[PDB]
């Protein structure tokens, strides 16, 4: 089949800011090429179509170029909404391809997450297992790093996490992370608590409780 | 086997199959090719084949030869995609195009396991009690060990949209989810405002309104 090559993979761009991703064909396909644009949960949206014609409606900002093999997508005062998943597409040749997609995040300045920490709940515990959660709210960027600690025991392989989709308003990020001990393991301890290191905090914050109650 | 309605989710077990249904607008044409497309977490959009509702016409992408099977019920103007012997290289979310929107069609899941349906346990993430700010105050509902996705989570049924933290959901060692939920709001609130997390488990017809306040 026809491969169709998109880069970059991921990008960071500010608001006002212009977009350019590329989109190469392994074979020439003429203009037979369109441009989606996917928002977080959403389904993907036409932009461009026969490689340079805007769909009714899509703002100037977008613009669709190229002929043959080379085909770009530029986006022009990136709003904070334009946040999403960016494909190409070629038609020309069966099977019809996609290209492999451009995460578009917006870059902001930096803000450090608010934390918060909270016990397992008397109705978990009573089914056995513990779960203790931390939670990061809206920061940026996302990179952060979450170590929760038991006795000032620093812990491993016992937590997962999850972040949230950038915030289409003020372009912010959240994350949860949860520590599971069985309920035996739980009270073999004191100290819980969840140290987070973040680049808007000079120093890492940490939230913690006593098992109690 | 399974019948999946556009937009919804279903689970299916391997070797079995599924068929998902996606109707016309209904809008006169000559032809009315709609596409099937194929999405995957990690993975590149893969087209596998269009249908013409109108003369029943196909053309497959020879890789999902094999798999799909493109039909469409002309008296009720409804395409339909069989998908046969299933892998978990068929869990993924599928997309049917119409020509007259520029949005796709919904998109509708499926999830290929042989691990039976679990409904989940719904627990508090209370407000920091007896060592409560004056600020902003942060809780939620922890929803945990169930199967299949998806679950879904709003707050006052709907009447509670700011500062709403809804995460992706977590696949555990035990091949269960576990999804959580917050909000944050003000600290003051708490001795008046009343917050409950509305759950939801489809698959399994569960159904959990969950108030949630400081513990005492
Ligand atoms: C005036 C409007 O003219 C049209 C938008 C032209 O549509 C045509 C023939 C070209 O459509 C392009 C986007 C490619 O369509 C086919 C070959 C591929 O279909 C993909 C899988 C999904 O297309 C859907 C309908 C577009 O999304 C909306």
């Known amino acids: 089949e026809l491969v169709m090559t998109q880069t970059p993979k991921f990008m960071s761009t500010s608001v006002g800011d212009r977009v350019s991703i590329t989109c190469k064909a392994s074979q020439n396909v003429g203009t037979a090429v369109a441009w989606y644009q996917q928002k977080p949960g959403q389904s993907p949206k036409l932009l461009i179509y026969?490689?340079?014609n805007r769909y009714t409606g899509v703002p100037d900002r977008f613009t669709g170029s190229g002929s043959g093999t080379d085909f770009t997508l530029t986006i022009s005062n990136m709003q904070s909404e334009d946040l999403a998943d960016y494909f190409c597409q070629q038609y020309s040749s069966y099977p019809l391809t996609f290209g492999g997609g451009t995460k578009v995040e917006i870059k902001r300045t930096v803000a450090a997450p608010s934390v918060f920490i909270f016990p397992p709940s008397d109705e978990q515990l009573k089914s056995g297992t513990a779960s203790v959660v931390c939670l990061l709210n809206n920061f940026y960027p996302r990179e952060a790093k979450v170590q929760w600690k038991v006795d000032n025991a620093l812990q491993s392989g016992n937590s997962q996490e999850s972040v949230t989709e950038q915030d289409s308003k003020d372009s912010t990020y959240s994350l949860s992370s949860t520590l599971t001990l069985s309920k035996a393991d739980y009270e073999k301890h004191k100290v819980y608590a969840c140290e987070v290191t973040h680049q808007g905090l000079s120093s890492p914050v940490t939230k913690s409780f006593n098992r109690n109650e | 086997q399974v019948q999946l309605l556009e937009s919804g989710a279903e689970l299916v077990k391997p070797g079995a199959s599924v068929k998902l249904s996606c109707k016309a607008s209904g809008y006169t044409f000559t032809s009315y090719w709609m596409h099937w497309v194929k999405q995957r977490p990690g993975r590149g959009l893969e087209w596998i084949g269009r249908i013409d509702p109108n003369s029943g016409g196909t053309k497959y992408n020879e890789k999902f030869k094999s798999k799909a099977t493109l039909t469409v019920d002309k008296p009720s103007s409804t395409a339909y995609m069989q998908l046969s012997s299933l892998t978990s290289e068929d869990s993924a979310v599928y997309y049917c195009?119409?020509?007259?929107?520029?949005?796709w069609g919904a998109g509708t899941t499926v999830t290929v396991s042989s691990a039976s349906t679990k409904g989940p346990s719904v627990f508090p993430l209370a407000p920091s009690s007896k060592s409560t700010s004056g600020g902003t105050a942060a809780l939620g509902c922890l929803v945990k060990d169930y199967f299949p996705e998806p679950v879904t989570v709003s707050w006052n049924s709907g009447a509670l949209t700011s500062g709403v933290h809804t995460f992706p959901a977590v696949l555990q060692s035990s091949g269960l989810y576990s999804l959580s939920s917050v909000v944050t709001v003000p600290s003051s609130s708490l001795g008046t405002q009343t917050y409950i997390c509305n759950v939801n488990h489809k698959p399994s017809n569960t159904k959990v309104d969950k108030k949630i306040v400081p513990k005492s």
């Open positions: 026969s490689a340079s």
């Open positions: 195009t119409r020509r007259d929107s520029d949005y």
